[PDB]
Design a protein around this ligand. Structure first.
Ligand SMILES: [Zn+2]
Length: 258
């Protein structure tokens, strides 16, 4: 028995094993576009992924993750509301059983079909493990996905999902360029938050892009063919692996645009 997204181990149950689930800076949250404050002091985001080195893709039972080599400043995020350099370590998605749901963050209560999370850690802390224990340890770039035209740069990812259908499976995934998953504009909203999966640590500086990317119905459909279960067990489709919006509490969402 452990956490998941089912009726008996879902998000509503997480607080029993992870008390911080009821914390003061939990994520995701609903972004109220009319209450968000435009902050003129927010610097443009700086994304340097030209030297990114992907290593492997794996199904960990909660989602599928694409891991990168973070032993050097190959793929980093700077600028915006950030102080210092943050290295990309992995990216994963959150999707639904239907196109009308799937994203974790919502915009004026609107839900998207999926949400992409590019996770980076503050190099000042030496490694990911140390970074998660700090209030400014991580920086997660959130990108919304809507169903429409296919996204060419996502196809390499969808085609390998068949090889990691069940929990525990992993496969070599080299030379994948994450720049193909970025929207045209880098305008964003930012607020202090947490990881959206256990341990739910409050060490994240969220950067959510305003412009979503479009993916085809066929591409998202392949996401839905993955399994939460491990091989040799009753099949449970990996769908709706998203956490519902949490209380904003004493926090303000800032916008880089007006
Ligand atoms: Zn995530």
């Amino acid at each position: 028995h452990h956490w998941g997204y089912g009726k008996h181990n879902g998000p509503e149950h997480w607080h029993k094993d992870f008390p911080i689930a009821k914390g003061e800076r939990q994520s995701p949250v609903d972004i109220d576009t009319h209450t968000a404050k435009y902050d003129p002091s927010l610097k443009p985001l700086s994304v340097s992924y030209d030297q990114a080195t992907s290593l492997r893709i794996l199904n960990n039972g909660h989602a599928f993750h694409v891991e990168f080599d973070d032993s050097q400043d190959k793929a980093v995020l700077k600028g915006g509301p950030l102080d210092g350099t943050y290295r990309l370590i992995q990216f994963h998605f959150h999707w639904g059983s239907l196109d009308g749901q799937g994203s974790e963050h919502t915009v004026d209560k609107k839900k998207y079909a999926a949400e992409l999370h590019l996770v980076h850690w503050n190099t000042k802390y030496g490694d990911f493990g140390k970074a998660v224990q700090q209030p400014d340890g991580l920086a997660v770039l959130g990108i919304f996905l809507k169903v429409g035209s296919a996204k060419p740069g996502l196809q390499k990812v969808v085609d390998v999902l068949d090889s990691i259908k069940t929990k525990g499976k992993s496969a070599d995934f080299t030379n994948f360029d994450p720049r193909g998953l970025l929207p045209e504009s880098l305008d964003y909203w930012t607020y202090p938050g947490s990881l959206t999966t256990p341990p739910l640590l409050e060490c994240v500086t969220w950067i959510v892009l305003k412009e979503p990317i479009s993916v085809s119905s066929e591409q998202v459909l392949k996401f839905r063919k993955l399994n939460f279960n491990g091989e040799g067990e009753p099949e449970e489709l990996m769908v709706d692996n998203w956490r519902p919006a949490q209380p904003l509490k004493n926090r303000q969402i800032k916008a880089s645009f007006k």
